[PDB]
Design a protein around this ligand. Structure first.
Ligand SMILES: Nc1nc2c(ncn2[C@@H]2O[C@H](COP(=O)(O)OP(=O)(O)O)[C@@H](O)[C@H]2O)c(=O)[nH]1
Ligand SMILES: [Mg+2]
Length: 242
């Protein structure tokens, strides 16, 4: 049993059942979502949120990946949660061979590249991480990618709007994904990487259906699974590691 699914709001399960069924007609009855990111960004919390139960560890401070599989009515979602890819402000190459080792003989259907919304810049390290992922998995992982921005409930401090701040922050990271993967114009706009927002804090405003809602009113956990279901299905080739 997927026990976390009975603890979702009534309207979140209505939508999840509707998205899993839309896959079960392309004859896909399972999918593998890899979760990659720097430490601190909320990768483990987004897994706990998606699964609807506390299944991976949550911390302000390693070491092996953990696969989390749940089945609901003929459909299997496997989500791999990884160590942070960063340490001492340098790309951690060991955490990357551990993730690489756990993925040999697996088919990755979606990558969720996770970062925080609530951050004012991107640097060399952010690009060093994009490049290490490209060198590990191939430029093709970015055709199966979602940019997932946690802390979505943040309020920019400086008299500057939520949509101005977040479209700048998104633009930033997508431009860093492009440069770091050294993809050409045509290849980059034809992976057309979507940006989805996450609010994992228990402090998170609910909408009128008890769904964890973004500042615009939308149940972010349905938005995330619609988007996952879509990359899993966009008919770009999936990433088999061997
Ligand atoms: N407010 C808020 N805090 C978050 C969110 N996601 C994660 N956190 C917090 O950030 C810290 C790092 O979380 P974790 O999920 O372990 O991220 P990881 O290191 O990438 O696995 C924890 O103390 C979390 O509670 C979010 O969406 N909103
Ligand atoms: Mg973690």
């Amino acid at each position: 049993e997927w026990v976390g699914f009975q603890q979702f709001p009534a309207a979140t399960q209505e939508k999840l059942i509707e998205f899993f069924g839309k896959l079960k007609q392309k004859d896909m009855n399972s999918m593998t979502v890899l979760v990659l990111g720097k430490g601190g960004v909320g990768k483990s919390s987004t897994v706990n949120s998606l699964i609807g139960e506390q299944v991976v560890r949550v911390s302000p401070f390693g070491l092996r990946p953990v696969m989390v599989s749940r089945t609901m009515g003929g459909f299997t979602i496997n989500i791999i949660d990884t160590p942070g890819l960063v340490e001492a402000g340098y790309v951690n190459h060991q955490a990357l061979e551990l993730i690489k080792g756990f993925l040999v003989n697996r088919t990755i259907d979606v990558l969720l590249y996770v970062d925080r919304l609530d951050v004012y810049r991107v640097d060399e390290l952010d690009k060093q991480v994009v490049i290490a992922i490209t060198q590990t998995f191939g430029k093709e992982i970015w055709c199966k990618t979602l940019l997932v921005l946690t802390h979505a409930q943040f309020s920019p401090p400086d008299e500057l709007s939520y949509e101005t701040f977040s479209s700048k922050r998104s633009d930033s990271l997508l431009k860093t994904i492009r440069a770091g993967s050294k993809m050409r114009k045509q290849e980059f706009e034809d992976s057309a990487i979507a940006v989805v927002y996450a609010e994992n804090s228990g402090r998170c405003s609910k909408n009128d259906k008890d769904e964890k809602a973004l500042p615009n009113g939308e149940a972010w956990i349905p938005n995330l699974v619609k988007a996952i279901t879509d990359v899993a299905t966009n008919q770009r080739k999936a990433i088999h590691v061997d």
